[PDB]
Amino acid sequence: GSHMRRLQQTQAQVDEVVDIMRVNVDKVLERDQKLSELDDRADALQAGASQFETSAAKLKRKYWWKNLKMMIILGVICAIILIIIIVYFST
Amino acid sequence: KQALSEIETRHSEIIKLENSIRELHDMFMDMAMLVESQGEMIDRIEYNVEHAVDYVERAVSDTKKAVKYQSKARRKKIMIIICCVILGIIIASTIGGI
Amino acid sequence: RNELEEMQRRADQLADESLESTRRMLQLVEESKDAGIRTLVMLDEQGEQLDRVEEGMNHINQDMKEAEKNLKDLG
Amino acid sequence: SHMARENEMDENLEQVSGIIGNLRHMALDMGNEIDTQNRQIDRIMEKADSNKTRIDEANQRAT
Numbered sequence: 001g002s003h004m005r006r007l008q009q010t011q012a013q014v015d016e017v018v019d020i021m022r023v024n025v026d027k028v029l030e031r032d033q034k035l036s037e038l039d040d041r042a043d044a045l046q047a048g049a050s051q052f053e054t055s056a057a058k059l060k061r062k063y064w065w066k067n068l069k070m071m072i073i074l075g076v077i078c079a080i081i082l083i084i085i086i087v088y089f090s091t
Numbered sequence: 092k093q094a095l096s097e098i099e100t101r102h103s104e105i106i107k108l109e110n111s112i113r114e115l116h117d118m119f120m121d122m123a124m125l126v127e128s129q130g131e132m133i134d135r136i137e138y139n140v141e142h143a144v145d146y147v148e149r150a151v152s153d154t155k156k157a158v159k160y161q162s163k164a165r166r167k168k169i170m171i172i173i174c175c176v177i178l179g180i181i182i183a184s185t186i187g188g189i
Numbered sequence: 190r191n192e193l194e195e196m197q198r199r200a201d202q203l204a205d206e207s208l209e210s211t212r213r214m215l216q217l218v219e220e221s222k223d224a225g226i227r228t229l230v231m232l233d234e235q236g237e238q239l240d241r242v243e244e245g246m247n248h249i250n251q252d253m254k255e256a257e258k259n260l261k262d263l264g
Numbered sequence: 265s266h267m268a269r270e271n272e273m274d275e276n277l278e279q280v281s282g283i284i285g286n287l288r289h290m291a292l293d294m295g296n297e298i299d300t301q302n303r304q305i306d307r308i309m310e311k312a313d314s315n316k317t318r319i320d321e322a323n324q325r326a327t
Contacts, residue, residue, distance in 0.1 A: 003274060007104050010281045013288065014111050020291045021118040027298045028125050034305045035132055041312050042139035048319040049146040055326040056150045060157045067160040070167035077174045084181055095200055102203045109210050112217050115287070119221040123228045130231060137238050144245040151252045154259045161263070204269060211273040211280070218283045225290050232297055239301060239308075246311045253318050260325060 003101065006277070006281060007101070007108070010284070011104075011108060011111070013281075013284050014108070014115060017284065017287055017291055018111070018115050018118060020295060021115065021122075024291070024295050024298070025118075025121070027295070027302060028122070028129075030302055031129065031298065031305070032125075034302060034309070035129060035136070038305060038309055038312065039132060039136050039139075041309070041316060042136045042143070045312065045316055045319070046139050046143040046146070048316055048323065049143045049150065052319055052323045052326070053146050053150045055323060056153045056157070059326070060153045063157045063160050063164075067164040067167060070164045070171060074167050074171045074174070077171050077178070081174055081178055081181070084178060088181075095196065098200060098203050102207050105207050105210055109214050109217075112214050112221075116217045116221045119224045119228070119287075123224045123231075126228055126231055126235075130235060133235055133238055137242055140242050140245045144249055147249050147252050151256045151259075154256045158259050158262060201266065204266060208269055208273050211277055214280055215276050218280055218287070222283055222286060222290075225287065225294075229290065229294060232294065232301075236297070236301065239304060243304065243308055246308055246315065250311060250315055250318075253315065253322075256322070257318070260322060
């Protein structure tokens with residue numbers, strides 16, 4: 001009687017659920033392909049970055065020394081003019 | 092006889108519902124699986140990014156220190172080139188005065 | 190009555206499998222509920238991690254533009 | 265008793281029908297969030313490809 005109604009509707013409900021969970025699975029699969037692929041760039045950008053961190057790390061050193069040079073070569077030149085001076089102050 | 096064909100049709104569907112609920116049970120365990128399984132696949136995309144974010148964070152700060160010493164070298168280099176031409180006319184006067 | 194007795198035993202026999210399955214179903218649901226709640230609580234935590242991750246790409250794409258100038262001032 | 269048996273299974277079956285009212289809900293909320301994240305992931309990749317081309321562009325500007 002009134003329990004043969006529960007069956008009618010309590011079923012279509014589940015139908016609805018699984019029908020939905022069907023399309024949900026097809027989304028969790030696009031998630032796979034979109035993710036596993038992004039992960040291929042997570043590496044390929046931790047490597048594009050850590051290889052530019054090398055180029056950059058060095059671009060600092062090499063740069064740096066040319067400032068030391070030009071304060072050593074301003075030291076000898078500030079000393080050569082100093083001695084080229086002790087020689088026209090003397091005779 | 093008539094109430095034995097109604098328990099036969101009610102039971103007949105209580106299993107048609109139980110066999111259908113198991114299918115939905117699996118749909119939810121087949122979900123806590125693929126999601127949580129991809130949960131290991133995300134932490135690696137976070138780990139890789141938080142490092143790749145940090146690599147760029149330093150990699151740019153160095154490009155800055157790496158333009159400072161240029162004007163500082165350039166100065167210290169032409170300050171030399173100043174005291175160079177200076178030395179050439181300080182020695183071109185011991186040739187213009189024997 | 191021997192034929193009218195082996196017909197109410199199967200009648201009360203289908204009420205043991207309908208009562209046993211009403212329990213086996215009841216549990217298949219709660220575990221689908223619980224195994225569902227966790228699926229959700231995770232989509233949230235994951236959901237947050239993906240947000241830091243997006244900030245990262247804008248934070249990055251912003252700092253790359255910064256270096257694209259300090260590479261310019263240098264030939 | 266078959267009067268407290270049919271009164272029990274038609275009682276713990278009340279819940280069965282109930283929780284599947286929950287499952288129905290969870291189903292959607294979960295379903296939509298995903299399509300939000302998928303849309304997002306799609307976004308992040310387009311911004312990633314503009315970043316691996318600006319790194320490779322600038323990393324061949326080191327030589």
